[PDB]
Design a binder for this molecule. Structure first.
Ligand SMILES: *[C@@H]1O[C@H](CO)[C@@H](O[C@@H]2O[C@H](CO)[C@@H](O)[C@H](O)[C@H]2NC(C)=O)[C@H](O)[C@H]1NC(C)=O
Lengths: 49, 1246
């Protein structure tokens, strides 16, 4: 299917909605550990490639 | 075995179809009835359809039942029904067979008014919607637009009243993604057919002339490599040659038809003049490549010659770019394939073989010489050979036809076919070989269809005349043979063909009917029961039928000419064989010029109707069951055959200036006339009528109305101009009169443009049959669409091009994004009910652009709700084992709290279907009597003890506290006791690193405690247990030092746990920390460990669980080992739930619900309580995730902007334009479930 693997989050980030494989166009939401706060667009869009 | 039957049925039942099931019985002579029925599987309980059929001598014991599986009678829901019982019952026999069913009834054709759209256009779309019988389906259709990102964009459902579904126009979202958008159509309800279409959303201007690159053929080999002639032609869409132009050719060595470094060949980049619209060119690969690159030969380049061509009018402002994406350099150019060739022998019938020759980047090569050689194997492997026949392929079909006279002894033929390519060795003239096997009759009781290779299409209403010969030892007994005619899945005709006295048999004389027109399949069968044993004998042939439309809708304009004139009023006449709906679309032929080979929307629609043919190949078969299976049938018989052995891979054998208008649907009552004015475009309007009626779809002849003006201006206004750039609007005046003319062209423009020439003017002259380059320099001052009137004051009055210039602001258009996940229940924590997006005007905005903003919302559906429950046998827990001494009371009552909670957390007290535990009042009485009995165990100073006078146990006290906290949500209880017992447990038994160290109870009460690991991490176990209890109770007495104690204990767990010795301890402490800082890095590390201790079954885990110390080899009966395993699994599960990781959880709920995997029942309390807890939580979670969220979006200083009624039926938020300057609020109620809303800000930065 070529749906995207689970991405590497930013450091001190974690994947909110962990999944083994993401369908094309799934938002995976990054969120920051307790010390840290997401500034920006926390979401990665799994592209068809 | 004289008395036998065949019931013949479509291989697969289409739901909602009418399946004509035909029964033949042999050797009966008394009349009898049979019933044929479709019954639910496996229970046979519901009769979806039944048909009563009389079998008798005037029937000739042949009849059929029209059975229909009505779609709403199938149970539906989470599981589709994959199977059904076809059953027959009579006085003499009964049999039932599991038949597959398919939810795939009918056809959805999506007609998009253009292949290509600029932004800011609306894509008009309509779906033609046909039943399995090719009748108007009258089913409402869900139509889904997918941006090439693949993100769902929009869903619209429209009622089908007509078989034409005129959807609302889909306005391209205000920042589309360019490229191939997808439209998916699905029937809204039961049937799950799909239609799909594509349209390209692209910045384009309609090309003015169709530059055509027409290489002699699509490959280069030894012949061509030195010299490869390639022809350029260019014609205007009004179809007059571009009388002169400058042609620019550029070449590249393209390794693959991919985005590439083209390695352009400056050695070969070439100019030619387009003499009268044509320029022959040739490329020499030798001088080009050797002079520029290492590659000496195409031995080095099994690759592609890229070629791009620019044609510039040379006397005009228009230029058009054409390309071939690549021409294959090839050592071996061709490949063979068979067409319509059964690969099955009919011994004594001439065996036709047809090979097509395809080149690379396949097209039919037409004229390649082909030779075929074969070895003939007779019975007992008596092998022999045939002389190699030769044939040239048919020039207009690519087919080399062959016929081999085969002796009736042949058992198998294996034959090789090779290209006698004169310019190649065989080592490059590719060659292929195939096995053809005889019918393998057991009795040698053969039947042959004497179909004379009549691949020429049959004509509707002509009588078929197929000779059939049942050559059999027992032709004395074969009174008659049966035939079936198949079209799509359906048995459209069936019948019987007597033996004449001479032992000739009747031909199949039946006329070919309009229901056959795409294709048909004739199957012919008999049972002969010689000796005492029946053989089903059968054959089939592919029948190629003409694509004759049923309604034969034809469309023509009433006036006729070489060309109409702009604005000419014209009548369109639609004439049809019957009352019909007809859908009209006119598009500019230019629009296909935007692309190379843009296929007309409804190309080859009959070739799509053909895909409902359940058979494959040209007929024949390996065996009777194989003959039926390849015909797309299946059968019930007692005649010693079944096709359940016949399963196979899927079978792939081959056998004003508008751009579009007239987008209308009319009832044409056998005739109708439209009148309209032809638009001002000087172009060929391809007008496509599509008829729909009770006889299906008929895409008509595409009328091509030439719109033409003797003398005119056409202006090459680019799609878009950068604001405030000096640009030449180039153009061309054309004179197609034989006399020359003197013309003045001038530009009249709105004040949003300022202009140079400002002319009456120079009054230049143009020759006859000629065009003069015209140009204007302009500066666009302001953003938007500005009317420019180009005009041509000249003999015969005037011409005036009313045009719009489109002006875009300077710099770079940047897009940047913000969103939020709205979790109005805290599904992930903090209640994200509301968010605010300030209108943050950037520091580097270009002076007068507008910031565009666009908002959309995605519903995050919960997915698979794996549903698991306690049995009503939880009456076992309600009515538990005696309330005796030795804490047996505690074991009795503790589970009752949990079971009450479980029942509270669900429908169980909304509804019991059976065995009700509905008397929640009595259950609450028993609950509070329990809480009394446990509070009895409280000692003096708010410790608990196993006994009224026993040693104070911190373990028991934390357990009690857990219980009481859990139940305080349902029965209010005196929190002062909770405060006192909490501060007792903290102050007396906290110690650093080793929190809540246990006071000696002298024994593990293994019925209530676990048996922990004793040597090490006993303290990690106990700290975890106590932290769990406190986290369950501190919420109802949040005294500050209890929080300090939680800080201490959590820190100690986070530090000590990570090198866990035991999965049990790891699990429980993971849980305890999940109650605490869900997001601490140490916690996440421990989680990431636990998640790897997990054991699973299946490539995607179907089951997941945790075990340690091999306490699993002994799982046959519930015991301490299985108890521990269940404990540690339930802790893992609880943990996950607190992470809200449903995808993880699900296979753990599936494991936990299969009693056998842990020895049946639970053992001890802990496992049981934790399992009930986990199922409770999981239920809860699933509810919380259920998407039901009416999301308000409103500006801050103004009215509401949109209301997304997000629901699992309608989870997709259409992109809403948010173009006003207000700060933007998005909010929702308590709602339900989880959504994410995204606003993208698009702005031009200097
Ligand atoms: C371009 O020419 C058209 C006429 O062909 C102009 O449109 C007319 O404008 C006048 C004044 O506003 C109206 O009274 C007419 O009814 C309009 N006719 C039509 C058909 O729209 C248009 O204003 C001209 N534009 C420029 C920039 O010169």
């Amino acid at each position: 299917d070529s749906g995207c693997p689970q991405p590497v989050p930013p450091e001190n980030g974690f994947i909110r909605n962990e999944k083994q494989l993401y369908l094309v166009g799934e938002d995976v939401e990054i969120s920051c550990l307790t010390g840290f706060e997401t500034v920006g667009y926390q979401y990665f869009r799994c592209l068809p490639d | 075995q004289e008395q036998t039957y065949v019931i013949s049925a479509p291989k697969i039942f289409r739901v909602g179809a009418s399946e004509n099931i035909v029964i033949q019985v042999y050797g009966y002579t008394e009349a009898f009835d049979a019933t044929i029925s479709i019954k639910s599987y496996p229970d046979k309980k519901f009769s979806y359809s039944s048909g009563h059929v009389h079998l008798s001598s005037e029937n000739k014991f042949q009849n059929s039942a029209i059975l229909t599986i009505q779609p709403k009678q199938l149970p539906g829901g989470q599981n589709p029904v994959s199977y059904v019982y076809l059953e027959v019952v009579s006085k003499h026999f009964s049999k039932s067979k599991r038949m597959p069913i398919t939810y795939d009834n009918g056809f959805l054709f999506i007609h998009t008014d253009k292949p290509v759209y600029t932004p800011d256009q609306s894509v008009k779309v309509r779906v033609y919607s046909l039943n399995d019988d090719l009748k108007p389906a009258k089913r409402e259709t869900v139509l889904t637009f997918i941006d090439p990102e693949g993100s769902e964009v929009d869903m619209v459902e429209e009622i089908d009243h007509i078989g034409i579904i005129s959807f609302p126009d889909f306005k391209i979202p205000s920042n589309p993604r360019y490229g191939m958008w997808t439209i998916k159509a699905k029937y809204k309800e039961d049937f799950s057919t799909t239609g799909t279409a594509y349209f390209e959303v692209k910045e384009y201007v309609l090309p003015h002339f169709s530059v055509s690159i027409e290489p002699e053929y699509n490959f280069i080999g030894y012949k061509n490599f030195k010299n490869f002639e390639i022809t350029i032609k260019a014609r205007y869409f009004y179809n007059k040659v571009v009388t002169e132009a400058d042609v620019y050719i550029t070449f590249g060595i393209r390794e693959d038809l991919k985005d590439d470094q083209k390695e352009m060949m400056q050695t070969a980049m070439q100019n030619t003049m387009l003499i009268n619209g044509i320029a022959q060119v040739t490329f020499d690969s030798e001088t080009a490549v050797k002079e520029l690159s290492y590659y000496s030969l195409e031995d080095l380049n099994n690759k592609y010659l890229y070629i791009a061509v620019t044609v510039i009018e040379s006397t005009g402002g228009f230029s058009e770019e054409a390309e071939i994406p690549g021409i294959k350099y090839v050592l071996s150019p061709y490949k063979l394939n068979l067409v319509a060739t059964p690969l099955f022998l009919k011994p004594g019938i001439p065996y036709p073989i047809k090979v097509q020759v395809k080149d690379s980047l396949d097209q039919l090569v037409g004229g390649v010489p082909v030779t075929l050689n074969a070895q003939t194997i007779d019975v007992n492997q008596e092998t022999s050979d045939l002389d190699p026949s030769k044939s040239v392929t048919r020039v207009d079909d690519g087919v080399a036809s062959f016929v081999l006279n085969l002796p009736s002894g042949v058992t198998v033929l294996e034959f090789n076919v090779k290209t006698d390519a004169p310019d190649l060795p065989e080592e490059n003239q590719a060659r292929e070989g195939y096995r053809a096997i005889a019918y393998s009759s057991l009795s040698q009781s053969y039947l042959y269809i004497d179909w004379t290779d009549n691949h020429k299409a049959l004509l509707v209403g002509e009588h078929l005349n197929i000779i059939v010969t049942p050559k059999s030892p027992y032709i004395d007994k074969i009174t008659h043979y049966n035939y079936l005619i198949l079209s799509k899945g359906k048995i459209i005709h069936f019948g019987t063909r007597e033996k004449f006295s001479d032992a000739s048999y009747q031909s199949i004389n039946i006329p070919v009917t309009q229901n056959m027109v795409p294709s048909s399949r004739l199957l012919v069968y008999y049972i002969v029961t010689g000796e005492q044993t029946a053989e089903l004998v059968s054959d089939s042939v592919w029948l190629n039928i003409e694509e004759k439309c049923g309604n034969q809708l034809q469309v023509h304009l009433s006036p006729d000419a070489d060309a109409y004139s702009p604005g000419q009023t014209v009548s369109l006449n639609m004439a049809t064989g019957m009352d019909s709906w007809v859908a009209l679309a006119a598009v500019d032929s230019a629009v296909y010029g935007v692309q190379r080979g843009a296929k007309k929307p409804l190309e080859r629609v009959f070739q799509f109707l053909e895909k409902s043919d359940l058979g494959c190949g040209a007929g024949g078969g390996l065996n009777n069951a194989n003959v039926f299976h390849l015909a797309g049938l299946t059968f019930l018989t007692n005649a010693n055959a079944d096709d359940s052995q016949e399963n196979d891979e899927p079978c792939k054998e081959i056998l004003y200036f508008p751009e579009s208008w007239l987008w209308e649907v009319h009832l044409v009552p056998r005739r109708k006339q439209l009148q309209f004015a032809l638009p001002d475009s000087l172009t060929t309007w391809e007008i496509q009528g599509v008829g729909i009626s009770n006889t299906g779809i008929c895409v008509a002849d595409t009328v091509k109305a030439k719109v033409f003006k003797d003398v005119f201006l056409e202006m090459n206004i680019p799609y878009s101009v950068v604001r405030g750039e000096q640009i030449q609007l180039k153009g061309t005046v054309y004179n197609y009169r034989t006399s020359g003319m003197q013309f003045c062209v001038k530009m009249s423009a709105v004040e949003g443009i300022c202009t140079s020439e400002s002319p009456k003017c120079v009054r230049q002259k143009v020759e006859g049959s000629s065009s003069h380059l015209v140009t204007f320099t302009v500066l666009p001052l302001e953003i938007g669409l500005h009317n420019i009137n180009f005009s041509l004051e000249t003999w015969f009055g005037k011409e005036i091009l009313v045009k719009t210039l489109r002006v875009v602001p300077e710099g770079v258009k940047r897009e940047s994004y913000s969103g939020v996940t709205l979790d109005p229940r805290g599904i992930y924590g903090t209640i994200s009910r509301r968010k605010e997006f300030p209108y943050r005007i950037p520091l580097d905005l270009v002076p007068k652009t507008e910031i565009k903003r666009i908002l959309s919302v995605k519903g995050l559906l919960v997915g698979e709700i794996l549903s698991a429950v306690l049995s009503q046998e939880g009456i076992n827990i309600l009515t538990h084992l005696p309330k005796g001494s030795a804490e047996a009371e505690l074991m009795s009552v503790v589970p009752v709290f949990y079971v009450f909670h479980y029942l509270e957390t669900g429908n169980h007290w909304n509804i019991f279907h059976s065995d009700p535990l509905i008397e929640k009042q009595k259950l609450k009485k028993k609950l509070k009597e329990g809480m009394l009995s446990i509070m009895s165990y409280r000692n003096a100073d708010y410790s608990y003890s196993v006994w009224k006078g026993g040693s104070a146990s911190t373990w028991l006290t934390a357990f009690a506290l857990r219980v009481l906290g859990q139940v305080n949500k349902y029965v209010e209880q005196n929190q002062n006791s909770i405060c006192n017992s909490l501060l007792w447990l903290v102050e007396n038994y906290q110690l650093d690193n080793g929190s809540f160290k246990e006071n000696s109870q002298y024994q593990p009460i293994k019925l209530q405690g676990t048996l922990p690991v004793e040597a090490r991490e006993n303290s990690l176990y106990l700290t975890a247990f106590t932290v769990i209890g406190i986290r369950k109770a501190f919420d109802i007495c949040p005294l500050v030092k209890i929080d300090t104690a939680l800080i201490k204990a959590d820190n100690f767990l986070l530090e000590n746990t990570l090198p866990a010795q035991s999965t049990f301890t790891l699990a429980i402490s993971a849980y305890a920390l999940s109650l605490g800082d869900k997001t601490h890095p140490q916690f996440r590390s421990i989680v990431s460990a636990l998640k790897r201790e997990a054991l699973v079954k299946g490539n995607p885990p179907i089951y997941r669980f945790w075990k340690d110390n091999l306490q699993h080899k002994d799982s046959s009966v519930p015991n301490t080992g299985t108890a521990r395993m269940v404990e540690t699994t339930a802790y893992a599960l609880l943990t996950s739930l607190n992470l809200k990781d449903i995808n993880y959880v699900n296979p753990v709920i599936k494991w936990l619900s299969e009693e056998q995997r842990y020895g049946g029942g639970f053992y001890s309390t802990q496992d049981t309580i934790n399992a009930i807890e986990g199922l409770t939580e999981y239920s809860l979670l699933v509810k919380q995730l259920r998407l039901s969220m009416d999301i308000d979006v409103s500006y801050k200083h103004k009215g509401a902007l949109h209301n997304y009624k997000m629901t699992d039926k309608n989870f997709l938020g259409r992109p809403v334009e948010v173009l006003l300057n207000d700060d933007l609020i998005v909010s929702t109620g308590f709602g339900s479930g989880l959504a994410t809303v995204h606003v993208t800000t698009v702005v031009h930065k200097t």
